[PDB]
Amino acid sequence: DIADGQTQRFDFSILQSMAHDLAQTAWRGAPRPLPDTLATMTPQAYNSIQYDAEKSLWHNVENRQLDAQFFHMGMGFRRRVRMFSVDPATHLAREIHFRPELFKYNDAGVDTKQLEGQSDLGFAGFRVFKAPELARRDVVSFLGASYFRAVDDTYQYGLSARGLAIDTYTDSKEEFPDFTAFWFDTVKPGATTFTVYALLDSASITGAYKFTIHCEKSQVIMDVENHLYARKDIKQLGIAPMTSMFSCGTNERRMCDTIHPQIHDSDRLSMWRGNGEWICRPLNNPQKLQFNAYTDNNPKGFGLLQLDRDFSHYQDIMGWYNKRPSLWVEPRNKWGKGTIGLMEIPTTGETLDNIVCFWQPEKAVKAGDEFAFQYRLYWSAQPPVHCPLARVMATRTGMGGFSEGWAPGEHYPEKWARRFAVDFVGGDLKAAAPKGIEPVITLSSGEAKQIEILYIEPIDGYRIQFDWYPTSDSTDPVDMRMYLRCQGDAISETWLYQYFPPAPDKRQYVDDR
Amino acid sequence: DIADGQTQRFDFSILQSMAHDLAQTAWRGAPRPLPDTLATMTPQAYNSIQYDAEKSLWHNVENRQLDAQFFHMGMGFRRRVRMFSVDPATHLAREIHFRPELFKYNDAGVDTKQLEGQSDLGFAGFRVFKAPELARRDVVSFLGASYFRAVDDTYQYGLSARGLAIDTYTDSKEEFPDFTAFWFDTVKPGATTFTVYALLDSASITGAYKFTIHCEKSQVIMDVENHLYARKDIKQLGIAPMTSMFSCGTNERRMCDTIHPQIHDSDRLSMWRGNGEWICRPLNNPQKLQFNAYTDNNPKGFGLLQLDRDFSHYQDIMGWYNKRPSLWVEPRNKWGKGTIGLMEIPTTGETLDNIVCFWQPEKAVKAGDEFAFQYRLYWSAQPPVHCPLARVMATRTGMGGFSEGWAPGEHYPEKWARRFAVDFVGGDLKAAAPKGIEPVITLSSGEAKQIEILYIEPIDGYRIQFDWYPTSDSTDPVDMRMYLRCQGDAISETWLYQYFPPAPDKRQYVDDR
């Protein structure tokens, strides 16, 4: 009912055609300035603008389990996005032109007369609500350049995902692709899923995106198919990028001066390689910008996970980090050779998303190149696929050089060493204990001296604790790999960790006594 | 059967007589050197000496729920302690002379011929076992100068208590009273409780101690009655001292570079004043030695508590800090004016007991003075008496100067401030919330700016969070008192905290960016 634009035929092939035509032509450029009312507005004024639930998308669909509400122009959202409604039966799309009557400005200093003849103006994005609460809490949100977020049955929006990433870690500056348009298929009566088509535009790449989002009871499953058309040479391309935050946690705690024991939207990076090996990579908050590439030939799955769901580990009631979802990327086709990038930015608090994970194809991207990637996104804790063997539970790092449970109190340890504790749960650990669980530790630098295997009754797991001794002053990052091998065969997933030793002068403890 | 000494009449009045006679005479002095085998022995050799369970005390008592095994001379235990067995029916005590046949040395380099004619040699102490395991795990242990420890139904020996404390915090050195002798009443068949009489001797004080220890299903209750006779002038006297450990926890974490999130045998000091006010004093690990005296007129109860029983907060499998008991002291009579001392020593790990709490009578101790104190000791988590009002759950301290849940990530907070978060649970907090919970915060120095009251669903409690601003450069310790007052009346127990601000030059955050 809110779609008043001209009727035009639309399809996925049609969407690919305009994306190809857009790549063949010059870039539109930076967004033009917004009207003076929106351009100069208070952040509190923008938050007072509420979309009209009576004028929401699919409001005339009887017995509906979904509802869509659009956002408003303003703040950092300067790119106008056009929304269309397309009938699934007859492939005709009608443009939903922006009108001031679609919003209630309330306590906003908007004149509303400058937005009267502003049909060219669009929206900042959209959010989708579920059946029990069709206008209160959204399960799927598409806000920003290309960022989109979804929630599990606990709601509590956590990490975000984008449609593309360009030059994430290169000598050049970051380029942010924009979702310039959206096509919404009309939701069927009593339908959990819905389909939305997105047109991605950027200064060096254009793409056609198709999203099939299923809002299940305990998870949100998104089927993403894209067709990228390169406009210029791209030195770094990221497929299905993941944006999250990691400030502190069960890791090296160099930022722990806060009332919250752990602050992170995600604590680990789990990878399912083509050969079938599961890799656990805990996230880090390094002092310097870090980029890590993990070579893969056909990744069966990867993503950032929030495996710590206990509230007492976070002690946050405004963010609810324990209720935040975990994102898992499941490719549908063979993606070929490439690397899973992982960029970690230093951070102080929780207002900056410093974790970026994406898939980078091995082949260099040139002008006129074409790409097609299909993958499934799972937005929930406890991702659908996990390692059948023993799984890493936590990665605790601390002082070493002393017997466990007998840390000296009158003095610091004489020899400086770093102690790493890794907890393994699941698999056949209790069966392999009588035969002998032998941990295999590979270190780029240094040596592991006090390798101990201990059993933890409350978690029904085994802890592998070792002390790392530098034996060098190169201060270069140290790569560690751990996996449990009982009968000459792996019984646990690989534990991948990047450790940054302190300076040689800082490899000691100062004591006032 | 193991008592072969001469029969002598013994009673509590008789024990008080020899304590009075001992005070009237000069001190025995430092213990004489042990035989060469025990004097020069390996720590591993001493641990190889095992007492004979067949020759244990009360071995001839049919249908017994208790068993007593003695310790051996060696290591820091250089004071010989004489053990006696006294029949409750006929008050006759027989001395249990030390014999080499009472121990199995096994892997010990002890000649055993030098200990043949060594009846004058005694024991380092004794331990008491319960009915299900009469020779494996002890519930009550008396090892050391005057230290004695007891366990709850989780076992896992934690904090210790002594019979007396002399000059705990004074310009002079520490003086350790010694339990020079022990009288054991024969345990009745099928009796949970047992009575042991102790003679305390020291360079400046002598005392007669009577212990009535009940080993209940979930707790150990000790009835302690003492009669102290001062031999010299004592400048500081401690009644029912408590010795514990506090390295890290939900507090100022200046020692947190370890795999264990919290290391402490006790986290708070709970006091029940004569007027009926409950005070919660979280323990601290200060950089410098600290002594605090809390004036009381008739203390109804005090002790060190371990209220955090969750394993995930400690992550220790060798110490099991979550299973350690809490000690509560319940005076039986009016103790009069005095102060509850609390000495905190700086510590690095967990091998040093740096928390000492004791009751100091107001009146100065002179030569020839007489004292008599009766109190009950409870050795279990969740002490029998707690505040009927709201109780403090945790005391989290961290960075301030920013809105909660929106800590800046690209930069540090502009203004330095310390944020204190106190969680209150129980009482009538949910009923007083509609009326308005007003927190009353008293600060010796500085001001509280951002006082916020928030509700925590998972713990069903309310968090009082405030930011402390220095407004001074005196770097002196800051005393804070908090209690919730809704209708002009207190609805929560008082929260007492001692905070040490950093140096004025250190009241800032350094950023590499």
Tab-separated table of C-alpha atoms in Angstrom, chain A residues 9-404:
chain	number	residue	atom	x	y	z
A	9	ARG	CA	9.608	-5.767	-14.263
A	10	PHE	CA	12.184	-7.079	-11.796
A	11	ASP	CA	14.091	-10.350	-11.459
A	12	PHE	CA	17.441	-11.645	-10.253
A	13	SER	CA	18.632	-11.688	-13.870
A	14	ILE	CA	17.320	-8.133	-14.267
A	15	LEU	CA	19.152	-7.096	-11.091
A	16	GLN	CA	22.359	-8.650	-12.426
A	17	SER	CA	21.881	-6.682	-15.652
A	18	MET	CA	21.805	-3.283	-13.936
A	19	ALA	CA	24.754	-4.249	-11.731
A	20	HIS	CA	26.689	-5.114	-14.893
A	21	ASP	CA	25.591	-1.842	-16.508
A	22	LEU	CA	26.554	0.081	-13.365
A	23	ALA	CA	30.040	-1.451	-13.455
A	24	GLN	CA	30.381	-0.536	-17.139
A	25	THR	CA	29.765	3.143	-16.289
A	26	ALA	CA	31.473	5.617	-13.987
A	27	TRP	CA	30.769	5.718	-10.263
A	28	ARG	CA	27.984	7.982	-9.031
A	29	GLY	CA	30.300	9.509	-6.429
A	30	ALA	CA	29.964	10.671	-2.858
A	31	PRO	CA	26.379	11.269	-1.679
A	32	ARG	CA	25.023	14.748	-2.291
A	33	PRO	CA	24.323	16.930	0.765
A	34	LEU	CA	21.074	16.248	2.596
A	35	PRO	CA	18.457	18.966	3.180
A	36	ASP	CA	19.465	21.508	5.804
A	37	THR	CA	17.019	20.104	8.364
A	38	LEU	CA	18.559	16.623	8.197
A	39	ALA	CA	22.132	17.803	7.571
A	40	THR	CA	22.253	19.905	10.766
A	41	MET	CA	20.345	17.874	13.353
A	42	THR	CA	20.992	16.851	16.936
A	43	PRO	CA	21.682	13.153	17.634
A	44	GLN	CA	18.810	13.283	20.129
A	45	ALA	CA	16.587	14.813	17.440
A	46	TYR	CA	17.301	11.934	15.048
A	47	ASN	CA	16.447	9.332	17.697
A	48	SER	CA	13.051	11.023	18.144
A	49	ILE	CA	12.014	10.114	14.579
A	50	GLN	CA	9.874	6.965	14.711
A	51	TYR	CA	8.593	5.061	11.692
A	52	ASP	CA	4.826	4.625	11.432
A	53	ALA	CA	3.882	1.035	12.250
A	54	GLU	CA	0.548	1.596	10.498
A	55	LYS	CA	2.453	2.422	7.288
A	56	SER	CA	4.916	-0.460	7.644
A	57	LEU	CA	5.720	-2.776	4.759
A	58	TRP	CA	3.426	-5.792	4.300
A	59	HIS	CA	0.797	-4.121	6.491
A	60	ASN	CA	-1.972	-5.342	4.158
A	61	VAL	CA	-0.781	-8.976	4.268
A	62	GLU	CA	-3.283	-10.877	6.398
A	63	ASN	CA	-1.982	-13.474	8.869
A	64	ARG	CA	1.605	-12.254	8.622
A	65	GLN	CA	4.554	-13.330	10.761
A	66	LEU	CA	6.867	-10.533	9.569
A	67	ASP	CA	6.851	-6.742	9.334
A	68	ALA	CA	9.358	-4.319	7.817
A	69	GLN	CA	10.017	-0.744	8.943
A	70	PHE	CA	12.390	1.662	7.216
A	71	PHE	CA	14.950	4.055	8.677
A	72	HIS	CA	15.394	7.792	8.122
A	73	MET	CA	18.073	9.891	6.464
A	74	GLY	CA	20.506	11.565	8.840
A	75	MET	CA	23.677	11.272	10.961
A	76	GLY	CA	26.313	9.153	9.179
A	77	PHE	CA	23.659	7.711	6.853
A	78	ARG	CA	24.087	10.100	3.929
A	79	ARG	CA	23.578	7.597	1.083
A	80	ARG	CA	19.996	7.491	-0.171
A	81	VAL	CA	18.661	3.939	-0.530
A	82	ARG	CA	15.642	3.192	-2.714
A	83	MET	CA	13.135	0.580	-1.541
A	84	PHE	CA	10.936	-1.423	-3.906
A	85	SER	CA	8.064	-3.857	-3.410
A	86	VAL	CA	7.949	-6.760	-5.875
A	87	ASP	CA	5.095	-9.250	-6.151
A	88	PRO	CA	6.467	-12.827	-6.125
A	89	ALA	CA	3.683	-13.999	-8.455
A	90	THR	CA	3.908	-11.249	-11.089
A	91	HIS	CA	7.475	-9.956	-11.243
A	92	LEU	CA	6.626	-6.244	-11.032
A	93	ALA	CA	8.432	-3.865	-8.675
A	94	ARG	CA	6.956	-0.600	-7.383
A	95	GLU	CA	9.177	2.027	-5.777
A	96	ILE	CA	8.376	3.099	-2.213
A	97	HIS	CA	9.099	6.818	-2.416
A	98	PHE	CA	10.039	8.545	0.829
A	99	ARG	CA	7.266	10.624	2.383
A	100	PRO	CA	7.204	12.639	5.628
A	101	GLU	CA	3.941	10.885	6.558
A	102	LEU	CA	5.833	7.587	6.952
A	103	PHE	CA	7.524	8.910	10.118
A	104	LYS	CA	6.489	10.626	13.348
A	105	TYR	CA	9.184	13.178	14.139
A	106	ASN	CA	7.816	14.013	17.620
A	107	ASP	CA	10.615	15.834	19.472
A	108	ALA	CA	12.565	16.613	16.290
A	109	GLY	CA	13.463	20.061	15.002
A	110	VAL	CA	12.572	19.076	11.435
A	111	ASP	CA	10.619	21.672	9.465
A	112	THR	CA	8.934	18.846	7.460
A	113	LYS	CA	8.283	21.351	4.642
A	114	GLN	CA	11.721	20.810	3.096
A	115	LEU	CA	10.982	17.063	2.908
A	116	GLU	CA	7.657	17.496	1.086
A	117	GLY	CA	8.988	17.422	-2.475
A	118	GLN	CA	11.842	15.035	-1.662
A	119	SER	CA	10.843	11.848	-3.469
A	120	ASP	CA	14.473	11.437	-4.561
A	121	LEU	CA	15.421	11.084	-0.891
A	122	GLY	CA	15.425	7.514	0.356
A	123	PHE	CA	15.951	5.618	3.599
A	124	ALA	CA	18.927	4.612	5.716
A	125	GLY	CA	17.816	0.970	5.775
A	126	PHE	CA	15.153	-1.333	7.157
A	127	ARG	CA	14.409	-3.654	10.065
A	128	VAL	CA	12.273	-6.803	10.173
A	129	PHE	CA	10.101	-7.884	13.111
A	130	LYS	CA	8.769	-11.315	14.046
A	131	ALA	CA	5.220	-12.521	14.664
A	132	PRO	CA	4.799	-12.171	18.475
A	133	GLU	CA	6.086	-8.557	18.446
A	134	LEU	CA	5.578	-7.068	14.983
A	135	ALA	CA	6.491	-3.482	15.927
A	136	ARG	CA	8.673	-3.598	19.075
A	137	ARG	CA	11.895	-5.601	18.578
A	138	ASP	CA	13.460	-6.397	15.209
A	139	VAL	CA	15.194	-9.678	14.409
A	140	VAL	CA	16.905	-8.553	11.187
A	141	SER	CA	18.332	-5.072	10.595
A	142	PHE	CA	20.028	-3.593	7.514
A	143	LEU	CA	21.559	-0.299	8.667
A	144	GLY	CA	24.681	1.390	7.340
A	145	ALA	CA	26.739	1.139	4.161
A	146	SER	CA	26.431	-2.635	3.775
A	147	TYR	CA	26.182	-3.803	7.401
A	148	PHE	CA	23.355	-6.154	8.336
A	149	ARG	CA	22.715	-7.804	11.696
A	150	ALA	CA	20.442	-10.595	12.893
A	151	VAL	CA	19.599	-11.997	16.318
A	152	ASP	CA	18.897	-15.370	17.896
A	153	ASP	CA	15.998	-16.221	20.221
A	154	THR	CA	17.678	-14.065	22.903
A	155	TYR	CA	17.554	-10.992	20.592
A	156	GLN	CA	20.368	-8.648	21.794
A	157	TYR	CA	21.967	-7.538	18.527
A	158	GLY	CA	25.667	-8.356	18.593
A	159	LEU	CA	28.225	-8.611	15.808
A	160	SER	CA	27.463	-7.318	12.319
A	161	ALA	CA	28.124	-8.579	8.800
A	162	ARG	CA	28.598	-6.635	5.569
A	163	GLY	CA	27.938	-7.536	1.960
A	164	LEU	CA	31.507	-6.837	0.852
A	165	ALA	CA	34.862	-5.559	2.083
A	166	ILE	CA	37.367	-3.656	-0.068
A	167	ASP	CA	40.997	-2.976	0.901
A	168	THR	CA	40.458	-4.000	4.522
A	169	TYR	CA	44.214	-4.175	5.240
A	170	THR	CA	46.298	-2.442	2.571
A	171	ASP	CA	48.422	0.671	2.126
A	172	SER	CA	45.366	2.447	0.695
A	173	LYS	CA	42.348	3.631	2.660
A	174	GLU	CA	39.213	1.623	3.369
A	175	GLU	CA	36.471	1.673	0.734
A	176	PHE	CA	32.935	0.978	1.930
A	177	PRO	CA	30.488	-0.555	-0.573
A	178	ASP	CA	26.957	0.821	-0.387
A	179	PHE	CA	23.615	-0.977	-0.632
A	180	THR	CA	22.072	1.639	-2.904
A	181	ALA	CA	18.720	-0.115	-3.399
A	182	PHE	CA	16.524	-2.838	-1.922
A	183	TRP	CA	13.799	-4.992	-3.486
A	184	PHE	CA	11.393	-6.660	-1.049
A	185	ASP	CA	9.379	-9.699	-2.065
A	186	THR	CA	5.904	-9.634	-0.547
A	187	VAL	CA	5.793	-12.013	2.406
A	188	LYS	CA	3.347	-14.891	2.126
A	189	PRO	CA	0.614	-15.165	4.778
A	190	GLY	CA	1.958	-17.100	7.743
A	191	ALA	CA	5.457	-17.294	6.245
A	192	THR	CA	8.554	-17.372	8.436
A	193	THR	CA	10.968	-16.543	5.608
A	194	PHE	CA	11.208	-13.558	3.275
A	195	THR	CA	13.351	-12.614	0.282
A	196	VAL	CA	15.059	-9.250	-0.246
A	197	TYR	CA	17.175	-8.223	-3.245
A	198	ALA	CA	19.998	-5.717	-2.775
A	199	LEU	CA	22.033	-3.725	-5.298
A	200	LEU	CA	25.588	-3.082	-4.100
A	201	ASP	CA	27.493	-0.108	-5.513
A	202	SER	CA	31.022	1.077	-4.770
A	203	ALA	CA	33.800	3.137	-6.320
A	204	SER	CA	35.522	-0.021	-7.602
A	205	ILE	CA	32.924	-2.829	-7.506
A	206	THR	CA	29.213	-3.371	-8.114
A	207	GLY	CA	27.158	-6.404	-7.174
A	208	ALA	CA	23.687	-7.913	-7.127
A	209	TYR	CA	22.711	-9.531	-3.825
A	210	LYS	CA	19.837	-11.904	-3.065
A	211	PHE	CA	18.959	-12.628	0.570
A	212	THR	CA	16.621	-15.439	1.638
A	213	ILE	CA	16.230	-14.886	5.382
A	214	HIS	CA	14.521	-17.512	7.553
A	215	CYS	CA	13.557	-16.300	11.039
A	216	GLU	CA	13.426	-19.650	12.812
A	217	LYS	CA	12.480	-20.116	16.459
A	218	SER	CA	16.050	-20.293	17.787
A	219	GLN	CA	18.111	-18.860	14.915
A	220	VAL	CA	18.043	-16.671	11.816
A	221	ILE	CA	19.298	-18.346	8.632
A	222	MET	CA	20.220	-16.156	5.655
A	223	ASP	CA	20.853	-17.564	2.176
A	224	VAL	CA	23.124	-15.087	0.380
A	225	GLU	CA	23.856	-15.220	-3.352
A	226	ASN	CA	25.873	-12.416	-4.934
A	227	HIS	CA	27.183	-11.502	-8.389
A	228	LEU	CA	30.069	-9.035	-8.161
A	229	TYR	CA	31.231	-7.016	-11.173
A	230	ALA	CA	34.591	-5.309	-10.715
A	231	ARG	CA	34.768	-1.748	-12.039
A	232	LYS	CA	38.441	-1.114	-11.199
A	233	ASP	CA	41.432	-3.149	-10.077
A	234	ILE	CA	40.970	-4.241	-6.456
A	235	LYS	CA	44.061	-5.111	-4.420
A	236	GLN	CA	42.101	-6.742	-1.574
A	237	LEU	CA	38.579	-8.183	-1.752
A	238	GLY	CA	36.609	-9.659	1.129
A	239	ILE	CA	33.724	-12.099	0.681
A	240	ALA	CA	31.154	-12.317	3.483
A	241	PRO	CA	33.004	-10.000	5.899
A	242	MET	CA	32.303	-10.279	9.620
A	243	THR	CA	32.580	-7.269	11.936
A	244	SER	CA	32.732	-7.834	15.696
A	245	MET	CA	34.314	-6.441	18.865
A	246	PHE	CA	36.873	-7.859	21.296
A	247	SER	CA	38.118	-5.769	24.229
A	248	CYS	CA	38.826	-8.245	27.039
A	249	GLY	CA	38.217	-11.884	27.827
A	250	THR	CA	39.820	-15.204	28.693
A	251	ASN	CA	43.040	-14.232	26.910
A	252	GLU	CA	45.885	-11.760	27.347
A	253	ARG	CA	44.156	-9.038	29.396
A	254	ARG	CA	45.968	-5.810	28.570
A	255	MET	CA	42.677	-3.861	28.878
A	256	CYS	CA	41.014	-5.129	32.056
A	257	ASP	CA	40.666	-1.934	34.152
A	258	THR	CA	36.876	-2.080	34.188
A	259	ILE	CA	34.048	-3.552	36.233
A	260	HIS	CA	33.263	-6.046	33.450
A	261	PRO	CA	35.474	-9.174	33.541
A	262	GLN	CA	34.981	-9.744	29.794
A	263	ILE	CA	33.923	-7.332	27.033
A	264	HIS	CA	33.601	-8.933	23.597
A	265	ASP	CA	30.913	-9.620	21.015
A	266	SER	CA	32.983	-12.641	19.921
A	267	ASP	CA	35.813	-14.520	21.621
A	268	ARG	CA	37.095	-16.967	18.994
A	269	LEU	CA	37.355	-17.614	15.260
A	270	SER	CA	36.365	-21.158	14.277
A	271	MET	CA	37.389	-22.492	10.864
A	272	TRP	CA	36.423	-25.709	9.067
A	273	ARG	CA	39.105	-26.321	6.449
A	274	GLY	CA	38.635	-28.315	3.263
A	275	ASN	CA	40.620	-31.280	4.576
A	276	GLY	CA	38.244	-31.510	7.549
A	277	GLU	CA	40.466	-29.960	10.231
A	278	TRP	CA	38.785	-27.719	12.805
A	279	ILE	CA	40.818	-24.722	13.987
A	280	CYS	CA	40.073	-22.657	17.101
A	281	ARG	CA	41.537	-19.138	16.952
A	282	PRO	CA	40.826	-17.028	20.058
A	283	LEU	CA	40.450	-13.335	19.332
A	284	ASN	CA	43.000	-10.859	20.667
A	285	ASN	CA	43.165	-7.159	21.480
A	286	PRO	CA	46.705	-6.366	20.304
A	287	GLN	CA	48.650	-3.214	21.064
A	288	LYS	CA	49.286	-2.741	17.324
A	289	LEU	CA	47.197	-3.372	14.223
A	290	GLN	CA	47.420	-7.027	13.187
A	291	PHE	CA	46.357	-8.880	10.042
A	292	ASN	CA	46.413	-12.673	9.719
A	293	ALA	CA	45.714	-14.734	6.596
A	294	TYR	CA	44.865	-18.439	6.891
A	295	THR	CA	45.243	-20.348	3.628
A	296	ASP	CA	42.351	-22.632	2.675
A	297	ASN	CA	41.482	-24.580	-0.471
A	298	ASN	CA	37.747	-25.192	0.040
A	299	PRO	CA	36.462	-23.823	3.368
A	300	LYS	CA	33.509	-25.837	4.623
A	301	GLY	CA	32.699	-23.127	7.168
A	302	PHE	CA	34.046	-20.252	9.248
A	303	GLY	CA	32.805	-17.537	11.557
A	304	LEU	CA	33.152	-15.676	14.827
A	305	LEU	CA	31.633	-17.423	17.839
A	306	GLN	CA	30.466	-16.278	21.278
A	307	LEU	CA	30.725	-19.527	23.241
A	308	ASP	CA	30.621	-17.910	26.715
A	309	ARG	CA	26.919	-17.502	27.515
A	310	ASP	CA	27.350	-17.109	31.286
A	311	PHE	CA	26.268	-13.707	32.589
A	312	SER	CA	28.672	-13.709	35.546
A	313	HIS	CA	31.624	-13.614	33.127
A	314	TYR	CA	30.467	-10.241	31.735
A	315	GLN	CA	28.501	-8.486	34.521
A	316	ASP	CA	26.905	-6.154	31.963
A	317	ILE	CA	23.205	-5.264	32.046
A	318	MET	CA	23.222	-2.581	29.323
A	319	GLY	CA	25.014	-4.546	26.599
A	320	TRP	CA	24.178	-8.149	27.545
A	321	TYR	CA	27.237	-9.665	25.886
A	322	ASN	CA	26.251	-13.136	27.115
A	323	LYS	CA	23.059	-12.975	25.017
A	324	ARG	CA	24.767	-11.820	21.815
A	325	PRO	CA	24.612	-14.244	18.868
A	326	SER	CA	27.383	-16.028	16.995
A	327	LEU	CA	27.765	-15.826	13.214
A	328	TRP	CA	28.683	-18.848	11.089
A	329	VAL	CA	29.361	-18.700	7.343
A	330	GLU	CA	28.644	-21.899	5.397
A	331	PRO	CA	29.684	-21.700	1.723
A	332	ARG	CA	27.276	-23.420	-0.654
A	333	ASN	CA	29.771	-23.998	-3.487
A	334	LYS	CA	33.491	-24.644	-3.818
A	335	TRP	CA	35.155	-21.276	-3.219
A	336	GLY	CA	38.583	-22.402	-4.421
A	337	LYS	CA	41.959	-21.327	-3.123
A	338	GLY	CA	42.057	-18.320	-0.833
A	339	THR	CA	42.759	-16.979	2.635
A	340	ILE	CA	40.504	-16.217	5.600
A	341	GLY	CA	41.581	-12.742	6.648
A	342	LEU	CA	41.441	-11.598	10.262
A	343	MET	CA	42.178	-7.960	11.114
A	344	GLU	CA	42.511	-7.004	14.786
A	345	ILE	CA	42.622	-3.314	15.723
A	346	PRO	CA	43.747	-2.047	19.151
A	347	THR	CA	40.821	-0.835	21.240
A	348	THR	CA	40.200	0.656	24.678
A	349	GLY	CA	36.494	0.174	25.387
A	350	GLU	CA	33.487	-1.271	23.563
A	351	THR	CA	32.338	1.486	21.174
A	352	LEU	CA	34.713	0.424	18.365
A	353	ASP	CA	34.321	-2.769	16.330
A	354	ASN	CA	37.941	-3.894	16.024
A	355	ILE	CA	37.499	-7.447	14.659
A	356	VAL	CA	37.127	-7.986	10.905
A	357	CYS	CA	37.020	-11.462	9.349
A	358	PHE	CA	36.496	-12.131	5.646
A	359	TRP	CA	37.285	-14.573	2.847
A	360	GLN	CA	39.798	-13.348	0.267
A	361	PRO	CA	39.975	-15.208	-3.071
A	362	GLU	CA	43.496	-16.094	-4.158
A	363	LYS	CA	43.098	-14.692	-7.676
A	364	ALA	CA	43.794	-10.983	-8.047
A	365	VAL	CA	40.812	-8.792	-8.912
A	366	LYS	CA	41.131	-6.812	-12.150
A	367	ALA	CA	38.789	-4.495	-14.014
A	368	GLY	CA	35.899	-6.298	-15.678
A	369	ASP	CA	36.202	-9.400	-13.494
A	370	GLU	CA	33.083	-11.322	-12.472
A	371	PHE	CA	32.452	-13.195	-9.223
A	372	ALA	CA	29.637	-15.339	-7.841
A	373	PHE	CA	29.584	-16.496	-4.211
A	374	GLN	CA	26.819	-18.436	-2.455
A	375	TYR	CA	26.886	-18.967	1.303
A	376	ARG	CA	24.562	-19.500	4.257
A	377	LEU	CA	24.678	-17.332	7.384
A	378	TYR	CA	23.655	-18.691	10.792
A	379	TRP	CA	22.856	-16.106	13.478
A	380	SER	CA	22.720	-17.947	16.806
A	381	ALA	CA	24.860	-19.264	19.612
A	382	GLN	CA	26.085	-22.852	19.278
A	383	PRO	CA	26.600	-22.877	15.480
A	384	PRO	CA	25.018	-25.809	13.619
A	385	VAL	CA	28.352	-27.527	12.890
A	386	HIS	CA	31.041	-28.116	15.518
A	387	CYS	CA	34.075	-30.362	15.766
A	388	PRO	CA	33.106	-33.972	16.600
A	389	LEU	CA	36.415	-34.276	18.479
A	390	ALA	CA	37.331	-32.393	21.656
A	391	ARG	CA	36.582	-28.669	21.462
A	392	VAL	CA	38.514	-25.779	22.990
A	393	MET	CA	36.590	-24.195	25.872
A	394	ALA	CA	38.893	-21.390	27.046
A	395	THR	CA	42.411	-20.016	26.541
A	396	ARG	CA	43.751	-18.589	29.804
A	397	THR	CA	47.130	-16.835	29.761
A	398	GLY	CA	49.078	-15.690	32.786
A	399	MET	CA	52.312	-15.737	34.729
A	400	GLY	CA	54.522	-18.807	34.546
A	401	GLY	CA	57.757	-20.119	36.022
A	402	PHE	CA	56.141	-21.735	39.070
A	403	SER	CA	54.246	-24.877	39.999
A	404	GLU	CA	50.502	-24.629	39.437
